């Protein structure tokens, strides 16, 4: 911790949204798994993204919000935003 968003950190926020839609490997290793296959609908994705902006004090660019089919892209955005944020 104390530097960027980690696997565990992101996992928490993700599993906070996707609940009652379990059975996937969201709690574990989801980085290269598609939101589609991990039980995420685009609507729930925006919910998560918005909460991320709120909680971590980040700002997700519109172009990035629609390129994140894999949590890897999301992770990258948050890390980029954290590094940018001072």
Curated annotation (Swiss-Prot):
<comment type="pathway">
    <text>Antibiotic biosynthesis; actinorhodin biosynthesis.</text>
</comment>
<dbReference type="InterPro" id="IPR006162">
    <property type="entry name" value="Ppantetheine_attach_site"/>
</dbReference>
<dbReference type="GO" id="GO:0005829">
    <property type="term" value="C:cytosol"/>
</dbReference>
<feature type="domain" description="Carrier">
    <location>
        <begin position="4"/>
        <end position="82"/>
    </location>
</feature>
<protein>
    <recommendedName>
        <fullName>Actinorhodin polyketide synthase acyl carrier protein</fullName>
    </recommendedName>
</protein>
<feature type="modified residue" description="O-(pantetheine 4'-phosphoryl)serine">
    <location>
        <position position="42"/>
    </location>
</feature>
<dbReference type="Pfam" id="PF00550">
    <property type="entry name" value="PP-binding"/>
</dbReference>
<dbReference type="GO" id="GO:0017000">
    <property type="term" value="P:antibiotic biosynthetic process"/>
</dbReference>
<dbReference type="InterPro" id="IPR009081">
    <property type="entry name" value="PP-bd_ACP"/>
</dbReference>
<keyword id="KW-0597">Phosphoprotein</keyword>
<dbReference type="GO" id="GO:0000035">
    <property type="term" value="F:acyl binding"/>
</dbReference>
<comment type="function">
    <text>Acyl carrier protein.</text>
</comment>
<dbReference type="GO" id="GO:0009245">
    <property type="term" value="P:lipid A biosynthetic process"/>
</dbReference>
<keyword id="KW-0596">Phosphopantetheine</keyword>
<dbReference type="GO" id="GO:0016020">
    <property type="term" value="C:membrane"/>
</dbReference>
<dbReference type="InterPro" id="IPR036736">
    <property type="entry name" value="ACP-like_sf"/>
</dbReference>
<dbReference type="GO" id="GO:0000036">
    <property type="term" value="F:acyl carrier activity"/>
</dbReference>
<keyword id="KW-0045">Antibiotic biosynthesis</keyword>
